[PDB]
Design a protein around this ligand. Structure first.
Ligand code: 50W
Length: 289
């Protein structure tokens, strides 16, 4: 669980977040090129508030053990703190889907969807709120397995409440946000369910650039909208039951799941356990199982 900086050989940059970056490394203590390849998350810019947040994120990941959650491997202290995770060779589900569009069918999208629901239900049992469900944050271990791959915005619910209020400074993923997250900064299992519906939408659009949630919402709101004005126009649109359209080729039963996740009434959104049952039932119908 304690990795020595000196044995961590840099291979490539994998991606960036707003404050955290991820790189591919080989942990080679024997310096004989037999060490395993790991993914290393570091703070792009070190500050004390970012350091405290990152220590909480490390503790959250360490506490999670599930097939559909990226594995915690350890830490690296140089504090230039680094989070060591297992390396997943197919990258983000966002990039994977976009390269294999023509080879990934609806039943395979539902296999991925089911795994996301199971990983999310597991978070819910620990009273953790992901706050950043998007296909860019899901990683592909193989053609049959996806995992929730980052927990940078994850919050633990207070003992006495079912929501957590936060307003993080600097650019939020508003087109994946539930209305109450936009208006009141309220994050809960139900706002994760709202974001899950957006992930389901993303999947069935096969990550078509023109069909992205920012592109569809900006179209509906007007491309002439300022910056702070976009949020207010998005709030109004959602309030008046403006929703993302049914993606091309999407079955009605799948779009129905999306629209039910997108209920303005927090209490009326399905649970992750019910989402998984519905998705598995549809998968079975499609397979004749
Ligand atoms: C997509 C690049 N990305 C990131 C990453 O940027 N995130 C954000 C916070 C910053 C995180 C997913 C949300 C994390 C990560 C990762 C990989 N394997 C294990 N982990 C943890 C992997 N593998 C890849 N393999 C290949 C061949 C790629 C290209 S990407 N790509 C990764």
């Amino acid at each position: 669980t304690q990795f020595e900086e000196r044995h961590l050989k840099f291979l490539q940059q994998l991606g960036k977040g707003n404050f955290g970056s991820v790189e591919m490394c080989r942990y080679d203590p024997l310096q004989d090129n037999t060490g395993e390849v790991v993914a290393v998350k570091k703070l792009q810019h070190s500050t004390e508030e970012h350091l405290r947040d990152f220590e909480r994120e490390i503790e959250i990941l360490k506490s999670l053990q599930h097939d559909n959650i990226v594995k915690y491997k350890g830490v690296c202290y140089s504090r230039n703190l680094k989070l060591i995770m297992e390396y997943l060779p197919y990258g983000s589900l966002r990039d994977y889907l976009q390269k294999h569009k023509e080879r990934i069918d609806h039943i395979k999208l539902l296999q991925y969807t089911s795994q996301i629901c199971k990983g999310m239900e597991y978070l819910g049992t620990k009273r953790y709120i992901h706050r950043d469900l998007a296909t860019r944050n899901i990683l592909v271990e193989n053609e049959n397995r996806v995992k929730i791959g980052d927990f940078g915005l994850t919050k633990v619910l207070p003992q006495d409440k079912e929501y957590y209020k936060v307003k993080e400074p600097g650019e939020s993923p508003i087109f994946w946000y539930a209305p109450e997250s936009l208006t009141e900064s309220k994050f809960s299992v139900a706002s994760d369910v709202w974001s899950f519906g957006v992930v389901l939408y993303e999947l069935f659009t096969y990550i078509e650039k023109s069909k992205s949630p920012p592109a569809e919402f900006m179209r509906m709101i007007g491309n002439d909208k300022q910056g702070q004005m976009i949020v207010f126009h998005l709030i109004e649109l959602l309030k008046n039951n403006g929703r993302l359209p049914r993606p091309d080729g999407c079955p009605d039963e799948i779009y129905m799941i999306m629209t039910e996740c997108w209920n303005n009434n927090v209490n009326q959104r399905p649970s992750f356990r019910d989402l998984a049952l519905r998705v598995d039932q549809i998968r079975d119908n499609m397979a004749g199982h």
